[PDB]
């Protein structure tokens, strides 16, 4: 049917690594499942989709914004408008992105799932996409960016602490950005820290819960829990 | 920092 | 003012990795340079827009090519359907970037080149994009594209042997290129396999005799045709 037409062509679109036409396809999926739950293979590949869509533009405002600090710092004020411009540019792509899926999660997913497995996913993913815009929006914007942001996170966080194993790669992948939150959006190192040790620390006390299949997801997060403190332990001295 | 895959 | 302008926006669309706003920037660049030649940096930023333009298109393709092929060995035509209509928009994705370089390389570029230099390096662009048309056309279309292919090698060969050093990074680019045109398109492994051969050993000749600041790119190259060499036979 529709549903299956378009998530064959969105995974179609992923082998071809035309994300922006996969992220339509998942878009049509969504569209196509009103009343109905996305499954647990087409929420993956919608989140693919937004993930690599918002990635690549993320990794090239990075960029531009090195440069652009680096030819402000230099006398060249001709070279750094035009970067501005450009950086600009990307910041609408930027918020294009994360208005779609914001509208497209807060809409329909989010009220539709009442899984707690689904609730948990989709308020983490909110709360992921609004720290997407938290990352380069400034003044009010920003704010609010950030005040949704820890709002999803904490719901987010609710639902998982009672009702999800520590292991749980979702609940895992929770605390993990959520600490990321802490860490790079709200500059408290000290939270951050404390949210990345308590993940992994309750992790491997229940670390009898995981699940075979759940087990190389979970496995990365924590040892991503441990590279984050890594660095944290290591910047609370550098 | 790194975040969720 | 307006050239560099577009030179720098080219650089920043690079650092950023957005190849279609670069492949824009350099095509403005070059509009704008009537009858002057590019620079041997706009060029290559030119070469680089238009190589990962297409190397995108040309990498999708190759994907969506064997997943065509195991659905079709599978009997799912209703999955080889679907996949046929992606392949054919990737296809006029394809032809429409070609195109594009093509007409950029034919109306001004070509026509400009003022040094054996550019002359070989626009020819053997010229050529390499023809090649990539000649990848996924078919039947007189593609007969077309590698006779068309052939004979921009042939023109950048001709300039590139009568005025380029063996060891010259854009003559020995030419040789590899040439040499895979018979492999892939023409499926003459003997005759890429000579090419390669005869292109190597004439580099190697002047290898330790001459060389200085050229070096690292003609080794690189040299090291490709040794490794195609090495793998033909
Ligand atoms: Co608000």
Same mark, same amino acid.
């Given at each position: 049917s529709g549903r299956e037409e378009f998530v064959?062509?969105?995974?179609?679109? %992923? !082998?071809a690594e035309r994300y922006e036409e996969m992220v339509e396809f998942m878009e049509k999926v969504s569209a196509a499942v009103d009343g109905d739950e996305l499954t647990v293979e087409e929420r993956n590949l919608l989140s693919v989709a937004? /993930?690599?869509? =918002?990635?690549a533009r993320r990794a090239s405002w990075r960029i531009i914004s090195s440069i652009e600090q680096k030819e402000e710092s230099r006398g060249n004020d001709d070279h750094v408008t035009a970067i501005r411009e450009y950086r600009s540019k990307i910041e609408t792509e930027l918020s294009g992105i994360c208005d779609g899926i914001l509208k497209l999660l807060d809409s329909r997913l989010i009220p539709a799932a009442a899984s707690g497995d689904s /609730?948990?996913?989709?308020?983490?993913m909110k709360g992921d996409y609004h720290r997407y815009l938290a990352e380069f /929006? @400034?003044? !009010? %914007? &920003?704010?609010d960016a950030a005040e949704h942001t820890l709002a999803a996170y904490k719901s987010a966080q609710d639902i998982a602490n009672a009702e999800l194993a520590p292991t749980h790669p =979702? &609940? #895992?992948?929770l605390a993990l950005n959520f600490s990321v939150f802490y860490y790079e959006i709200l500059n408290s190192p000290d939270r951050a820290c404390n949210l990345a040790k308590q993940a992994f620390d309750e992790a491997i006390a229940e670390l009898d819960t995981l699940g075979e299949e759940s087990y190389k997801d979970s496995t990365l997060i924590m040892q991503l829990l441990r590279d984050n403190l @890594? #660095?944290?332990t290591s910047d609370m001295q550098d | 920092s790194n975040s969720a895959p």
């Open positions: 064959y062509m969105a995974k179609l679109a %992923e !082998q937004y /993930k690599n869509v =918002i990635g /609730k948990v996913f989709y308020l983490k /929006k @400034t003044g !009010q %914007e &920003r704010k =979702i &609940r #895992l992948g @890594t #660095l944290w | -």
